[PDB]
Amino acid sequence: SHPALTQLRALRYSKEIPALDPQLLDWLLLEDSMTKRFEQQGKTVSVTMIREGFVEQNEIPEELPLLPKESRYWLREILLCADGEPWLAGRTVVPVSTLSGPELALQKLGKTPLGRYLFTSSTLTRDFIEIGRDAGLWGRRSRLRLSGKPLLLTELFLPASPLY
Secondary structure, three states: OOHHHHHHHOOEEOOOOOOOOHHHHHHHOOOOOOHHHHHOOOOOEEEEEEEEEEEOHHHOOOOHHHOOOOOOEEEEEEEEEEOOEEEEEEEEEEEHHHOOHHHHHHHHOOOOOOOHHHOOOOOEEEEEEEEEEEOOEEEEEEEEEEOOEEEEEEEEEOOOOOOO
16 A cells, blocks of 8 residues: 555556657656666666565456456565655566466565566566556556566656656
8 A cells, every 4th residue: 555556556548659759658668667777867776565465356456357367466566766766656466377487486576676687587578568647647557478477567657757
């Protein structure tokens, strides 16, 4: 529970990517989490854990239509900070069947920030990405696949971030 995650949950998406300026699209369509691109600004990046745990279908209404229907999912809600300053709120939902092989490590990642750099033995692909907005702020949701196994990642870009 946290104001930034409430804001993340209020994001309204468009099926079609809006015709935004190139610099903003570069950020929004990045094919990775923001961990390294935020480090690129000359910052240390850390994760503040807001919520970590297994949840059933009733707790993932926004992600359920985009994921396999299973008994359980791993839910990971975080604040991503740059030199301690919150820059993004993230909410990842992982169907438990995706937690196999190298991917079981997703459940024990803890405060290590997500990013392609962690996926040293699996192929990463994205088959869905939509940009959303909530009261002046931008966010996005993506369906990513690791060895073809899906997970949903939703990100809210806080105004402290360089997208603004």
